[PDB]
């Protein structure tokens, strides 16, 4: 009999959604409908409007109005709605859903211009929001937020919110002005997309928003983009009688509170990029913040469905005509490049863009190609982490569009140092495209002069093959093994041949890996099953860390002309425990990989290795979390396993760092003794990579503060390095 509960949830949403009638009528109509259904049970229409208040920000103003019309028809409704709101907000903060909580605050605020909440009533709490910046021994992050929650609402509620407490909103201003200037900015460098202050400065979020409020204040709190549904409802809204928000005291900081990490605004567009057409709001104007905040919110909702998401985006409310295409794209890349991590999964953006191009063939294409060009051109100061993502995106994007690109536009890189960003880009790009197809196809799609930066071929390197260098030890052992594998030999039949080898055995390994990878070099299918069949041989040969390292050494020596292969193997190698994480670490930081140390695949692996470690811990955490919820000597077994699962996880990061400091201080003291430049293409990558570790796996790392802080990153450490650790700390402080 809940057919009424279904129709309602529908009618609620159906108003914000497009229609063949004015938004006013839909709200007016929806009014009597819901009102007519209050005696005929309220509770639902209550828990409904509250949801739209949080999970449907992009439709903010529209639902605040609905709630308005209801107020101006039933005082007692708005009073139980606002009674609900705060309580909801009171639950959000405790669960630490600050991103969501700001949506409420922004709603409640708007309600003030809807004759529902008392103009002063809201400033009352807003004062308490700013008053937390006075609290002692509490992470800056908490402070930054409450200030965020405020300032951000103001582009809405402030126009009519300054007809009052302008006596206090001059106080709250100066109080937020002081704290704003007394805030450490340690993070910014680790969070910037580019380091170039030109042509678009990457500004801190709160340091940028303040610049958008000021433009508002001096413009008398007058904006030109937020649609007010209640402009044609002033007549019915005035006689409505506002409500009072009881005293609000922000939940005290506890060792159980988690606050949003600081963010740096992404800026790559201004009105001059698009000359002909509508004028894009300025970087410091509020409009811009508005559209961007809403677009981020549009994809926040319908990301799961790329097809719908396109439309919801292309058909945005935009009060004053804006250049949506550039705003859309700019917001996508803004998310894709969002350091540390994007809000969604990288691949999602790739596909979405493709959908957009399908939806608007006439406009979106041209822009994207213009955005690519720009992104490339500014490459030099771009942060590596973003670069990878860039490289990862485009290639994929090209694979859906017959690898068609006017490369000759980037003919400027051919005349640059290979270690330089721009050319390095095209390189890593093509290299990835090959894997999406085959090495030959790439040679036909690129210009003759770019042939140089083209991918090496996936040629296997068999040290003991057609090599006439018989002067190499264990030469025959491999040849005998060779025939052994071909004849369907077993482990014991393979041990036999190997027992007759001269010298953990450096040589016995070499002749094994090399030989098995050569007959299994054809496909990924063979190489695996091979590793699997003679798994016992592997696990016997590499029973030491020195051996586990060697395996990888030879393997690389064999497939150094085929990364994807190197990657897939290391993966399957650890999953079957033929090699562990620690080994792959000392291998990634080994002298054999120094000439490739800056190439993508390298770190890709290192991360694969890490994720697999990260996933491992979590699993054993859930298997123990489920176990306890119930012979049980299983819990003893698991508990003991968690201990070991973490221990190895700690060691991992401990290694990746210790080694990272080793190859850094090594370069810092070098350019100091010779007097050479520190900013080397290799230093850039190396140093920022150390940053990428701190950025992707921050969550876990915080667990070794006692160790990192006092042991691995102390004063004596060069400032350029320590900087990144102190940066990393700026996220949770």
């Amino acid at each position: 009999a809940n057919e009424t509960e279904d129709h309602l949830e529908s009618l609620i949403c159906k108003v914000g959604e497009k229609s063949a009638c004015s938004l006013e009528s839909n709200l007016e109509g929806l009014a009597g409908v819901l009102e007519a259904d209050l005696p005929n049970y309220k509770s639902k229409i209550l828990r409904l409007l509250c949801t739209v208040a949080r999970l449907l920000p992009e439709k903010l103003t529209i639902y605040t109005t609905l709630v308005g019309l209801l107020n101006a028809r039933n005082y007692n409704f708005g009073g139980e709605f606002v009674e609900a709101m705060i309580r909801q907000l009171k639950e959000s903060l405790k669960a630490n859903n600050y991103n969501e909580a700001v949506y409420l605050v922004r709603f409640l605020s708007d309600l003030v211009n809807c004759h529902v909440i008392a103009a002063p009533s809201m400033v009352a709490m807003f004062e308490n929001f700013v008053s937390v910046t006075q609290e002692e021994d509490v992470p800056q992050v908490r402070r930054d937020w409450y200030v965020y929650a405020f300032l951000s609402s103001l582009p809405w509620v402030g126009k009519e919110l300054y007809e009052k407490k302008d006596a206090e909103m001059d106080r709250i201003f100066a109080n937020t002005e002081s704290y704003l200037k007394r805030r450490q900015k340690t993070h910014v460098p680790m969070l910037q997309v580019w380091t170039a202050d030109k042509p678009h400065p990457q500004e801190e979020y709160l340091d940028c928003l303040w610049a958008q409020i000021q433009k508002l204040k001096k413009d008398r709190w007058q904006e030109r983009h937020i649609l007010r549904p209640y402009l044609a409802f002033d007549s019915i809204l005035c006689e409505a009688l506002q409500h009072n928000l009881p005293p609000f005291t922000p939940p005290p900081h506890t060792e159980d509170s988690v606050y949003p990490m600081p963010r740096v605004i992404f800026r790559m567009f201004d009105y001059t990029d698009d000359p002909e057409g509508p004028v894009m709001p300025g970087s410091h104007s509020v409009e811009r913040f508005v559209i961007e905040e809403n677009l981020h919110c549009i994809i926040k909702s319908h990301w799961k469905e790329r097809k719908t998401c396109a439309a919801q985006l292309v058909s945005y409310p935009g009060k004053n005509k804006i250049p949506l295409n550039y705003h859309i794209v700019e917001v996508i890349f803004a998310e894709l490049f969002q350091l540390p991590a994007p809000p969604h999964i990288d691949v999602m953006y790739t596909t979405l863009l493709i959908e957009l191009c399908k939806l608007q063939p006439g406009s979106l294409p041209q822009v994207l190609a213009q955005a690519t060009e720009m992104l490339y051109m500014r490459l030099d100061t771009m942060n590596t982490t973003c670069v990878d993502r860039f490289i990862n995106w485009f290639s994929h994007h090209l694979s859906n569009f017959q690898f068609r690109w006017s490369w000759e536009d980037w003919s400027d890189c051919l005349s640059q140092d290979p270690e330089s960003p721009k050319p390095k880009f095209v390189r890593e790009v093509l290299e990835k495209c090959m894997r999406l197809s085959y090495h030959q196809r790439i040679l036909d799609i690129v210009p003759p002069t770019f042939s140089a930066l083209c991918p090496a071929n996936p040629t296997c390197i068999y040290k003991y093959g057609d090599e006439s260098s018989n002067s190499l030890p264990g030469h025959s052992v491999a040849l005998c093994l060779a025939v052994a594998f071909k004849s369907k030999a077993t482990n014991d039949e393979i041990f036999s041949i190997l027992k007759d080898v001269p010298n953990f055995n450096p040589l016995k390994i070499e002749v094994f890996v090399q030989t098995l990878l050569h007959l299994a070099a054809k496909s990924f299918s063979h190489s695996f099953s091979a590793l699997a069949k003679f798994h016992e041989v592997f696990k016997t040969l590499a029973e030491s860390d020195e051996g586990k390292l060697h395996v990888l050494r030879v393997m690389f020596e064999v497939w150094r002309n085929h990364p994807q292969m190197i990657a897939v193997l290391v993966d399957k190698m650890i999953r079957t425990q033929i090699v562990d994480c620690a080994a792959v670490a000392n291998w990634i930081f080994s002298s054999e990989l120094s000439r490739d140390f800056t190439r993508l695949f390298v770190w890709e692996i290192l991360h694969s290795t890490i994720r697999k470690m990260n996933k491992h811990v979590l699993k054993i955490q859930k298997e123990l979390e489920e176990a306890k919820e119930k012979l049980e000597e299983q819990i003893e077994r698991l508990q003991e396993k968690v201990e070991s699962a973490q221990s190895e996880q700690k060691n991992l990061f401990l290694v990746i760092f210790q080694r990272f400091i080793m190859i850094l201080t090594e370069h810092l003291v070098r350019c100091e003794t010779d007097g050479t430049s520190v900013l080397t293409p290799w230093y850039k990558n190396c140093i920022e990579r150390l940053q990428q570790i701190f950025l992707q796996h921050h969550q876990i790392i915080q667990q070794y503060m006692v160790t990192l802080e006092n042991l691995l990153f102390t004063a004596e450490l060069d400032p350029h390095i320590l900087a990144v650790f102190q940066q990393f700390c700026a996220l949770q402080a």
């Binding site: 949830e9 529908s10 949403c13 949801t51 739209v52 999970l55 449907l56 909702s301 319908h302 799961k304 469905e305 790329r306 097809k307 719908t308 999964i345 990288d346 691949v347 999602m348 790739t350 596909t351 493709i354 990862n392 994929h396 694979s399 859906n400 017959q402 990835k432 894997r435 999406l436 197809s437 085959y438 496909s523 990924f524 299918s525 994807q564 292969m565 897939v568 993966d571 694969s608 994720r611 697999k612």
Partner: protein, 121 residues
């Protein structure tokens, strides 16, 4: 909690108003709890290495079983992709299904599971 919960691309039924090839949940049960997707309409010369790259951008893969011909024993035009957890599986289904591989639109669907003998046309 609303109609934004919808997942049209991962929806598990493709409600075919046709008779019988999926009626009892004795199977269906496995469908919605699967991590292996049936990928169909690949290029006759599409390699394992290639599929690996593409389907890994939506999460770590376990094993790819290349579709073969019960007669000619070669690329029949499909394959099966088994991820480690449904999470990554839904993504590929959400973002990879319908995109291009070796210059063609590949359609992916949910599969109860891989059994031996299923790789023959």
């Amino acid at each position: 909690l609303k109609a934004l919960r919808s997942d049209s691309y991962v929806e598990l039924s493709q409600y075919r108003d046709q008779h019988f090839r999926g009626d009892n949940e004795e199977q269906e049960k496995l469908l919605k709890k699967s991590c292996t997707l049936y990928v169909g309409n690949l290029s006759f010369y599409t390699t394992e290495e290639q599929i690996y790259e593409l389907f890994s951008k939506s999460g770590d893969i376990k094993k790819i079983i290349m579709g073969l011909d019960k007669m000619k024993k070669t690329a029949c035009g499909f394959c099966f992709v088994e991820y480690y957890s449904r999470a990554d599986a839904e993504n590929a289904m959400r973002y990879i299904n319908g995109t291009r591989l070796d210059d063609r639109i590949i359609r992916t669907d949910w599969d109860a599971g891989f059994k031996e003998g299923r790789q023959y046309g």
